[PDB]
Ligand binder design. Sequence first.
Ligand SMILES: Nc1ncnc2c1ncn2[C@@H]1O[C@H](COP(=O)(O)OP(=O)(O)NP(=O)(O)O)[C@@H](O)[C@H]1O
Lengths: 315, 50
Amino acid sequence: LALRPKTLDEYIGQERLKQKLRVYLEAAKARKEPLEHLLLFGPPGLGKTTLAHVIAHELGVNLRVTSGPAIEKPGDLAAILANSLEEGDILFIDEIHRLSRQAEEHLYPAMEDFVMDIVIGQGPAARTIRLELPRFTLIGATTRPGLITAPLLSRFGIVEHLEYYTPEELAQGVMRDARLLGVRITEEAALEIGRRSRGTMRVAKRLFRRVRDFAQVAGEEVITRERALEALAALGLDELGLEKRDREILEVLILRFGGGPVGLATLATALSEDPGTLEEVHEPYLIRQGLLKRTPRGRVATELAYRHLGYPPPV
Amino acid sequence: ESEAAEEAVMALAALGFKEAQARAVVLDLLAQNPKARAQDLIKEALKRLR
Ligand SMILES: Nc1ncnc2c1ncn2[C@@H]1O[C@H](COP(=O)(O)OP(=O)(O)NP(=O)(O)O)[C@@H](O)[C@H]1O
């Protein structure tokens, strides 16, 4: 459990992006040597950082990885840009939209002329000292394109979006990932996981773990549709991908609380739990499935949510 | 003192390092090689500072 894709061909899905990258790629892979700075938009768990290693591979360069939060002061970044990288390498920054204002201000020059300019003292002197940096390609990523990135956007050559994966692709993962772990599983089985994976590659691998965990704890010959379905059934996941607490959540917002604007706070402690959590973790999907819509009052379930559970549509 | 160091120190400070803490490392670095340039002094200090 330490091997992932290396060649871009080995990278699953994102076909639309693979073609564009493949172009920009083989170009600089032929011209000078650095790939233009790439900013990736897209939802979590779609495998951005993996694309980071892949591209790195295609060029024959190394990969440094860091997050926005981590760069707590320009220095943190200067340190990485001056010593961590070697001519050609790629520095990937996750949550890049949370870079300290100063930090971001020092980054522009780094991307443009591969130099960092520091301003010494002040007054009429206002002299500046420069750090000669190695040519490098910056690959940033935002768990929310939603304008929270500054005009740092204008410093990025390429700018694409990773899309959710079709369950077939997600499956293709579990599949050509099990053969790696020997683990015997049948096509549909994996594909049954796909359907449950929220279109994101992260949950898939996770779920496959859980499923293979509960499985072999009884047999060893093969995980087929049935084996898979029973395992999932055990952990409590419906065809829609919701979990044990997922139903329990939109549940207590019907009987315990009328199907009307409840209110985050009035829901968190209402059923023993935290709002930020039941908002930055459970609400997202429940919403993307149209079963929990947020209103300028509190929280409301939908006529579909009741259905998935088997209740008549109340007016 | 030394031109190269004062320069290196001020920059470190601008980058957000504890002024005093920066000087100590820069100065010792200087002691290892008195003829160092402000750029190498800074980077060489950048990997010893917290
Ligand atoms: N397109 C893909 N093809 C094959 N395997 C993939 C793909 N995308 C992701 N994976 C694998 O699934 C694992 C979990 O995905 P993920 O959570 O996205 O990790 P990551 O790419 O390292 N980080 P992040 O970009 O922040 O999500 C990765 O470590 C890969 O090994």
